[PDB]
Design a protein around this ligand. Structure first.
Ligand SMILES: Nc1nc2c(c(=O)[nH]1)N[C@H]1C(S)=C(S)[C@@H](COP(=O)(O)OP(=O)(O)OC[C@H]3O[C@@H](n4cnc5c(=O)[nH]c(N)nc54)[C@H](O)[C@@H]3O)O[C@H]1N2
Ligand SMILES: Nc1nc2c(c(=O)[nH]1)N[C@H]1C(S)=C(S)[C@@H](COP(=O)(O)OP(=O)(O)OC[C@H]3O[C@@H](n4cnc5c(=O)[nH]c(N)nc54)[C@H](O)[C@@H]3O)O[C@H]1N2
Ligand code: SF4
Ligand code: SF4
Ligand code: SF4
Ligand code: SF4
Ligand SMILES: [S]
Ligand SMILES: [W+6]
Lengths: 963, 214
């Protein structure tokens, strides 16, 4: 035996860092009673097979860390010191703060006299770090208290994705999963550094290569990913659409598209109305006054029944395919080669290698994460990837897909639970002031008159009603709909998002902020503005693992505690391996993890913190009364707790949903109290509850499917690695989305050797079919109104076809593709004292702002200090030596960093001028370690895009000087 | 006995192996500074049994050849470090009959530190300045004797790290050398008749590290 593990209890967990969702084994002392003694990889886990990157590998040192918070802490106004306090004190005083601010600032009706029932005096940040049951409970706590400013991580990195892919495929999610990468014949990594940022992914990527796949990295920098790809193609910042447009042209010119796939399963055959045109970088319906398009001009021509017209011959010149052909003829190799900085020869190499996956029995996959999709045409960057994938028949198939890599462990889950301002859980929009009734809300859902179009979103009313019944089961949904806050229809949607929360905070327009499992003092662009602006808060709640730059902004660099009047509550939360619950990985795998050791010192799961806090508010409102108490008093929290404790288990069962009385649905009978077996069996009439319709199927009468650890596979499942008995993915355990597109109209795979589904006997064998019905009797994209994979996407603000608009303001003065330089539906200074393009990115060893990993000695050991990566060309110019201290400065702030001179950075050629790019990690902050450095967000602008409301962190103007 | 096959053509320099070695033995972290490199700690020491060395080599066309070298004791079939210390004390350095692990014991405090280091062709052994004990990769002999993989091998995501019986490992190495040659035509095995840690180099081993091979 191994003495270290001999007397320890062994439990399973899921990594608390990136969205790969690697399995852990935890060993806990005194047969589970004491502290963890060991944390390493779970060798039975089908994704990581026991392997861990240094972040997963160091989770022991994250957990058993003497620097972790021990108890609630309290900072009095204008005080320069923390005072330890009890949980009883912290939560009551916070519960009073919530009620005071709310009672004062609550609004039943807006200026227009529309019912809204909200407070705009409190904002919340976070979080994708919390468990799914914690995220859902949190969303519903904040909404009962009437908040509309509810944001988290997802806004910055995964918001320009949901629309791009929803427009294209019907859903905003990663199409395949990690294990499926191994089935690809060509892997294109573009806007991703996955070897460093999703490291276990590279297990399956290199297994693709073992079976003959080509690995292509397309990055402005040569990274650890590049080191291990067959082809590295440098691209200059924001040249991605030229690159992707040139590929679309290459595919059509050389007829490398999957012809049958395109004709049947895309909208190639749909006829676009005569009012669609594109001339000189603008589409038709453009309004120069309002910098906005009238999208009604982009409508399909409809037949008598309202169904878009189709020419299956693809001959009509107003066919999507023919308009697509015409639109991308401008993107020839010479123009694309010139603007991207990628050689003509290297474009041909990458286009040939990837467009070859147009073969029915070859599959190509695209991997992108955050890259530079931050700007206003990030959504159009992604739309182009979708379109290339629909052209080559790569959507629905093994080794295909748009693999939009999620960032955090549970950012997929936290978005799914509606911790963004615009969505309730299950992506039901937050009703606006003009959705006066539940009936009006439900009338906003488009219908289709195509009998071959499933159009699943017509079921919305059953999901909204079942949702309202999980929060307010004693009320009719129709009545409960009035309890929850509404946003102004008259107001712009971005005004409720991340960056405008920082604008409003700097204008003193917020009393309280929740910084719940985030570090905005380092995470937000323009850190100096934000740190000052937090000084204009009345109260601040920070729930975190450690004291940090947010909890202690008031004693930050150049700050006088005495003058800063912000009251701060620091609540220390327990680590991932010290609580039970689920995280949803990038592949939608909702995986159950267990408690190893008991919480460290007096730390609590976020569940108990938020529940106890709300219970205090609630009993306060039973004592004092105050502003519209019905939403707080009526909230069903009894379904959340067991034995005076937040119950991950029960909350999960509620989110899945159960019948509130005896019901007949889909020709089957169900008893009161019985768990809902699928979202197919939810109702709009109040028979069913369900906190999240996507979770309906996850925790049934059969048990907790998220907790399954069964590697049983049929031959056909094992060949592509579906592992359908390993945990559970939404929707209804469909591992690969749009899989109906992977077979012909007889139900035979395009690629039988890597079949996703197959029609054998009178059934679909393999993955769960993404849409019921016999082969050739349904359109494959069931969440689409019209049912087709969209090449032409007329719901996008920027136009129905991706077009190149320069995201770089400063160093570019002319567009080679039109008269239109910048995004025509969108004032940077470009002070010549800042002649270089600063960018921020990650290293393998650190996590986010480094709040966590800067407390882990083994990660500091490998990456102890903020560095500045520059080319040999720029080191010659500013006289920088490898290792020399340098000063990186911008209009927003300045910092010191260690110079790394490397050939991995190169000058870009932009309009016959050498433009130097300098790189920084944003993993550093003033609190830890000693000599570590502060956040690169000292340098970044908080000027965002009116489209996305996301700030610039990948191309911002800096100067770099030797010290 | 047992053997490591390290296919350096699959390494992403994630440094899982580096962290994992220290988590398993609960080794302390060194004081480090960035001196214009990702490589840290800069060298092996008494508390660091494995560090990943980073080398940037120029090449025609975009990018570079980025060479990664996770360094450890080679657990030599005929250990020169033993042969040296056996003149001072037959016990300080011993060889496990079952695994072929070369193990430094507590009796290394009763030998010449530098003498045992200099005798090692790979410059592996390190000295605690306080206590004068020799430390290095011990092959996770503990774990192997209990049927577990070494921490650095289990944690590696790329298939770079491989462990098992010397018959299977020399079989894997020779078959993998053939397949990797198709991409990197100058790919070689490091001293594959003298060591139990057989690195596959994508080119001249000396580009990865001066002491990569004997
Ligand atoms: N080690 C580590 N891994 C992480 C994280 C972490 O903090 N540390 N965070 C996680 C989170 S929350 C997220 S959202 C993801 C983000 O994952 P990534 O998007 O992979 O992360 P970055 O390194 O910020 O950016 C990826 C790459 O985009 C490149 N890039 C920059 N500008 C452009 C451009 O104009 N075009 C193209 N094609 N590429 C460009 C950069 O050079 C960089 O190599 O990573 C996750 N994984
Ligand atoms: N310049 C620049 N800025 C960026 C980015 C960039 O690339 N460049 N990336 C952006 C992106 S993609 C993201 S995701 C954001 C991330 O920004 P933040 O979310 O603010 O990042 P951190 O706070 O560093 O990391 C997440 C937090 O999770 C907390 N945590 C961990 N486990 C738990 C738990 O169980 N409960 C609770 N309550 N908290 C827990 C940790 O304490 C840590 O503070 O940063 C954005 N900012
Ligand atoms: S950070 Fe991501 S890749 Fe690394 S161990 Fe955790 S889940 Fe796996
Ligand atoms: S864990 Fe494997 S891939 Fe990562 S640095 Fe070590 S040997 Fe290379
Ligand atoms: S590599 Fe050096 S220290 Fe290790 S067994 Fe060989 S001679 Fe001894
Ligand atoms: S075999 Fe064990 S001691 Fe040697 S480097 Fe690997 S983890 Fe460290
Ligand atoms: S994220
Ligand atoms: W992110």
């Amino acid at each position: 035996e191994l003495q270290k593990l001999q007397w320890a209890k062994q439990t399973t967990s899921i990594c608390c860092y990136c969205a790969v969702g690697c399995g852990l084994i935890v060993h806990t002392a005194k047969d589970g009673q004491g502290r963890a003694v060991n944390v390493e990889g779970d060798p039975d886990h089908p994704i990581n097979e026991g392997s861990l990157c240094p972040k997963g590998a160091s989770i022991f040192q994250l957990g058993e860390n003497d620097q972790r918070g021990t108890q609630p802490l309290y900072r009095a106004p204008f005080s320069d010191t923390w005072k330890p306090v009890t949980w009883d004190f912290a939560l009551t005083e916070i519960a009073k703060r919530i009620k005071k601010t709310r009672d004062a600032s609550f609004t039943e009706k807006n200026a227009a006299g529309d019912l809204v029932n909200r407070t705009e005096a409190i904002a919340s940040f976070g979080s994708a770090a919390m468990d799914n049951e914690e995220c859902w409970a949190y969303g519903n706590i904040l909404r009962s208290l009437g908040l509309v400013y509810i944001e988290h991580q997802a806004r910055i990195x995964h918001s320009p994705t949901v629309p791009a892919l929803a427009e294209s495929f019907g859903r905003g999610a990663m199409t395949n999963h990690w294990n499926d990468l191994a089935n690809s014949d060509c892997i294109l990594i573009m806007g991703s550094n996955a070897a460093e940022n999703h490291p276990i992914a590279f297990k399956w990527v290199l297994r693709a290569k073992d079976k003959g796949a080509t690995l292509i990295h397309v990055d402005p920098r040569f990274t650890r990913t590049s080191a291990r790809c067959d082809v590295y193609a440098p691209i200059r910042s924001g040249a991605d659409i030229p690159f992707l447009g040139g590929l679309i042209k290459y595919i059509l010119d050389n007829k490398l598209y999957f012809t049958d796939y395109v004709r049947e399963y895309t909208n190639a055959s749909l006829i676009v109305g005569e009012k669609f045109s594109f001339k000189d970088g603008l589409f038709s319906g453009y309004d120069a006054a309002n910098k906005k398009y009238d999208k009604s001009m982009w409508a399909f021509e409809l037949d008598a029944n309202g169904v878009p017209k189709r020419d299956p011959a693809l001959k009509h010149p107003r066919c999507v395919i023919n308009l697509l052909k015409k639109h991308y003829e401008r993107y020839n190799l010479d123009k694309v080669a010139a603007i991207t900085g990628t050689s003509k020869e290297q474009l041909q190499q990458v286009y040939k290698a990837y467009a070859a996956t147009g073969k029915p029995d070859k599959a190509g996959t695209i991997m992108y994460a955050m890259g530079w999709t931050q700007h206003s045409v990030g959504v159009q960057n992604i739309r182009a990837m979708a379109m290339i994938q629909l052209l080559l028949g790569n959507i629905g198939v093994a080794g295909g897909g748009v693999n939009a890599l999620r960032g955090e462990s549970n950012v997929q889950g936290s978005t799914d639970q509606g911790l963004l301002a615009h969505i309730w859980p299950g992506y039901n929009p937050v009703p606006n002031s003009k959705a006066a009734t539940l009936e009006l809300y439900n009338a906003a859902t488009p219908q289709s008159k195509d009998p071959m179009s499933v159009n699943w979103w017509q079921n919305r009313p059953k999901y909204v009603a079942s949702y309202l019944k999980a929060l307010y089961p004693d009320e009719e949904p129709a009545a409960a709909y009035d309890y929850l806050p509404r946003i102004d229809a008259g107001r712009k949607l971005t005004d409720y998002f991340w960056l405008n929360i920082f604008e409003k905070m700097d204008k003193g327009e917020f009393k309280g902020l929740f910084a719940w499992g985030m570090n905005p003092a380092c995470g937000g662009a323009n850190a100096n503005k934000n740190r000052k602006a937090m000084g204009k808060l009345e109260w601040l709640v920070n729930v975190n693992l450690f004291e940090n730059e947010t909890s202690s902004f008031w004693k930050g660099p150049g700050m006088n505690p005495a003058e800063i009047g912000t009251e701060v509550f620091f609540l220390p939360c327990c680590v991932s391996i010290e609580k039970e619950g689920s995280v949803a990985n990038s592949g939608r795998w909702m995986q159950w993890r267990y408690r190893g050791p008991k919480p460290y010192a007096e730390t609590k799961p976020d569940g108990d913190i938020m529940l106890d806090m709300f219970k205090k508010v609630r009993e306060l409102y039973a004592k004092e009364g105050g502003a519209y108490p019905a939403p707080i008093a009526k909230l069903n929290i009894a379904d959340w707790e067991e034995h005076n404790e937040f119950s991950p288990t029960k909350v999960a069962k509620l989110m899945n949903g159960y019948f509130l009385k005896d019901t007949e649905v889909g020709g089957k009978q169900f008893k009161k109290g019985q768990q809902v077996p699928s979202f197919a069996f939810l109702t709009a009439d109040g028979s069913t509850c369900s906190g999240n319709w996507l979770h309906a199927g996850s925790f049934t009468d059969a048990g907790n499917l998220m907790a399954r650890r069964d590697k049983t596979q049929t031959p056909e499942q094992a060949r592509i690695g579906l592992f359908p008995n390993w945990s559970f993915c939404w929707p209804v355990n469909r591992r690969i989305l749009y899989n109906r597109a992977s077979v012909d109209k007889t139900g035979k795979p395009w690629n039988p050797a890597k079949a996703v589904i197959e029609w054998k006997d009178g059934k679909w064998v393999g993955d769960v079919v993404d849409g019921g019905g016999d082969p050739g009797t349904k359109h494959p994209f069931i969440m689409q109104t019209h049912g087709f994979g969209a090449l032409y996407g007329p719901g996008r603000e920027e136009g129905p076809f991706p077009e190149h608009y320069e995201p770089l303001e400063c160093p570019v003065s002319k567009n080679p593709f039109s008269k239109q330089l910048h995004n025509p539906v969108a004032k940077a200074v470009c002070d010549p004292r800042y002649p270089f393009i600063g960018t921020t990115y990650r290293v393998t060893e650190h996590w986010q702002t480094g709040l966590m990993t800067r407390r882990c000695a083994w990660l500091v050991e490998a990456e102890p200090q903020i560095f500045c990566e520059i080319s040999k060309e720029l080191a010659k110019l500013r006289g920088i030596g490898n290792g020399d201290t340098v000063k990186v400065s911008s209009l927003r702030g300045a910092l010191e960093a260690v110079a790394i001179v490397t050939e991995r950075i190169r000058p870009f050629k932009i309009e016959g001028v050498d433009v130097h790019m300098v790189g920084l990690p944003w993993h550093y902050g003033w609190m830890v370690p000693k000599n570590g450095g502060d956040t690169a967000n000292l340098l970044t602008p908080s000027a965002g895009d009116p489209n996305t409301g996301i700030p610039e962190t990948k191309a911002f103007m800096v100067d770099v000087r030797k010290v | 006995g047992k053997m490591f096959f390290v296919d350096l053509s699959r390494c992403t320099a994630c440094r899982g192996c580096q962290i994992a070695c220290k988590q398993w033995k609960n080794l302390p972290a060194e004081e480090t500074r960035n001196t214009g490199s990702h490589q840290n700690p800069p060298d092996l020491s008494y508390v660091t049994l494995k560090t990943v060395r980073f080398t940037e080599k120029s090449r025609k066309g975009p990018g570079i050849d980025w060479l990664f070298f996770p360094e450890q004791c080679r657990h030599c079939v005929e250990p020169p470090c033993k042969g040296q210390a056996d003149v001072d004390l037959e016990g300080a350095v011993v060889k496990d009959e079952t695994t072929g692990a070369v193990l430094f014991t507590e009796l290394t405090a009763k030998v010449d530190g530098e003498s045992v280091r200099s005798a090692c062709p790979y410059d592996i052994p390190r000295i605690d300045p306080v206590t004068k004990r020799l430390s290095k990769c011990d092959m996770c002999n503990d774990r192997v004797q209990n049927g577990l993989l070494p921490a650095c091998v289990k944690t590696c995501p790329t298939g770079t790290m491989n462990f098992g019986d010397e018959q299977e490992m020399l079989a894997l190495a020779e078959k993998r050398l053939a397949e990797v040659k198709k991409t990197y035509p100058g790919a070689v095995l490091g001293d594959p008749n003298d060591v139990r840690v057989v690195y596959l180099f994508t080119r001249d081993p000396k580009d990865f590290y001066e002491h990569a091979v004997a």
